[PDB]
Amino acid sequence: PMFIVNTNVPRASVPDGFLSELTQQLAQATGKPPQYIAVHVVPDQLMAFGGSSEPCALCSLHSIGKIGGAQNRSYSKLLCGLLAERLRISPDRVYINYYDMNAANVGWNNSTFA
Amino acid sequence: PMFIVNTNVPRASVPDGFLSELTQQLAQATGKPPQYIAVHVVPDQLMAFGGSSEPCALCSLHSIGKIGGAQNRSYSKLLCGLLAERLRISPDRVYINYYDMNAANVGWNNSTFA
Amino acid sequence: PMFIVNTNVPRASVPDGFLSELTQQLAQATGKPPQYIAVHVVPDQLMAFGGSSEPCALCSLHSIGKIGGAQNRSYSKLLCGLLAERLRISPDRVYINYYDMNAANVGWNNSTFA
Numbered sequence: 299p300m301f302i303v304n305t306n307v308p309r310a311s312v313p314d315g316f317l318s319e320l321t322q323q324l325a326q327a328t329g330k331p332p333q334y335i336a337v338h339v340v341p342d343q344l345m346a347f348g349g350s351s352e353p354c355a356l357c358s359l360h361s362i363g364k365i366g367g368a369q370n371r372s373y374s375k376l377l378c379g380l381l382a383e384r385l386r387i388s389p390d391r392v393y394i395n396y397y398d399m400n401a402a403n404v405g406w407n408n409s410t411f412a
Numbered sequence: 413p414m415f416i417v418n419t420n421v422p423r424a425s426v427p428d429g430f431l432s433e434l435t436q437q438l439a440q441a442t443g444k445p446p447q448y449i450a451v452h453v454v455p456d457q458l459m460a461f462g463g464s465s466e467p468c469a470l471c472s473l474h475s476i477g478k479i480g481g482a483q484n485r486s487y488s489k490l491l492c493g494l495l496a497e498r499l500r501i502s503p504d505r506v507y508i509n510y511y512d513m514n515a516a517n518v519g520w521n522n523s524t525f526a
Numbered sequence: 527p528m529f530i531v532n533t534n535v536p537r538a539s540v541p542d543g544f545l546s547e548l549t550q551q552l553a554q555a556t557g558k559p560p561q562y563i564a565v566h567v568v569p570d571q572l573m574a575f576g577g578s579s580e581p582c583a584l585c586s587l588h589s590i591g592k593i594g595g596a597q598n599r600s601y602s603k604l605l606c607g608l609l610a611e612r613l614r615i616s617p618d619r620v621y622i623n624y625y626d627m628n629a630a631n632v633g634w635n636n637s638t639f640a
């Protein structure tokens with residue numbers, strides 16, 4: 299799976315250990331081996347949420363399966379919780395787009411997962 | 413909804429108030445309240461369109477509904493118009509990807525919109 | 527197509543001519559006119575793959591058609607090959623998400639491709 303967070307919070311406000319915490323917590327939440335979890339954090343962005351520029355985040359989670367109504371609710375609680383605790387972003391200023399990828403549409407290691 | 417623009421134009425060329433203008437224009441075009449519109453502008457990118465690094469943009473609009481054939485034509489006129497007037501990018505060097513999101517696949521505020 | 531690569535490799539390690547090579551090789555692999563191919567490279571990113579911040583890349587390829595099981599395998603060999611040769615990223619640390627876009631969902635030049 300792949301998790302991306304884009305945020306206006308400055309780089310200096312991203313704590314040590316943040317990528318590792320995302321990797322570990324997403325491995326647990328998705329049930330996928332951590333060796334297959336990729337994470338990407340993009341601070342210092344020019345962004346607004348509802349026309350205001352308090353801390354906010356726009357995120358995506360792509361996974362081959364492990365995406366659905368109840369699962370996505372659980373991921374949103376986990377991820378908003380981490381962004382609130384670690385980046386001080388209010389959960390009502392976070393969007394996370396979830397993508398259930400077909401295996402044939404995910405390239406890796408000179409091929410796809412199909 | 414979420415609107416993202418990635419462009420090679422320099423940050424100094426993005427006018428003050430551009431994020432607010434995008435927020436309000438997207439609220440009007442989509443019929444969604446501005447409180448739910450997020451906008452993200454990424455200048456200074458390393459990008460080419462047709463092999464040329466003249467000003468260009470790669471954009472996305474994600475929305476729960478309000479996406480379709482006629483609506484997307486109207487959004488493209490609006491958004492290319494704004495990128496041309498405000499960032500001096502030719503409409504023929506802009507791509508906009510439109511995504512009609514299922515409510516269950518959009519996380520927000522510790523849950524999803526489902 | 528349009529192709530985006532996000533990587534932790536530093537900007538100074540992206541060789542001259544890389545965007546051109548991507549544009550031309552994508553033209554060859556898809557048969558699409560190069561004048562409409564868009565490429566975007568984002569170096570210096572804060573990212574991990576399997577918990578490690580050795581060189582890695584997270585990419586997307588969007589196309590209207592020209593996406594499928596065999597085609598995507600061929601694109602992954604081409605693109606991983608380029609990322610390994612030019613950016614020194616191991617193919618097993620690359621993900622590429624493939625998107626088959628409906629023409630009505632791609633805006634360009636004040637309209638859509640529908």
Ligand SMILES: C[C@H]1O[C@@H](O[C@H]2[C@H](Oc3cc(O)c4c(c3)O[C@@H](c3ccc(O)cc3)C[C@H]4O)O[C@@H](CO)[C@H](O)[C@@H]2O)[C@H](O)[C@H](O)[C@H]1O
Nearest residue numbers: 507509527528558559562563588589590591627629632639
């Ligand atoms: C060339 C000519 O052709 C006609 O457009 C045709 C469209 O042409 C292209 C040609 C391309 O090279 C490229 C296009 C589409 O999409 C870019 C793209 C793809 C996915 C994205 O998410 C974002 C961007 C990638 C690119 O490389 O391709 C079809 C599919 O075959 C359509 O059915 C559609 O008929 C119209 O007359 C258009 O005005 C005129 O310029």
Ligand SMILES: [Cl-]
Nearest residue numbers: 299360361362
């Ligand atoms: Cl996956």
Ligand SMILES: [Cl-]
Nearest residue numbers: 398399400403
């Ligand atoms: Cl898919």
Ligand SMILES: [Cl-]
Nearest residue numbers: 413474475476
């Ligand atoms: Cl929405």
Ligand SMILES: [Cl-]
Nearest residue numbers: 480481482483
């Ligand atoms: Cl419509």
Ligand SMILES: [Cl-]
Nearest residue numbers: 512513514517
């Ligand atoms: Cl969806």
Ligand SMILES: [Cl-]
Nearest residue numbers: 527558589590
């Ligand atoms: Cl294409």
Ligand SMILES: [Cl-]
Nearest residue numbers: 626627628631
């Ligand atoms: Cl589509």
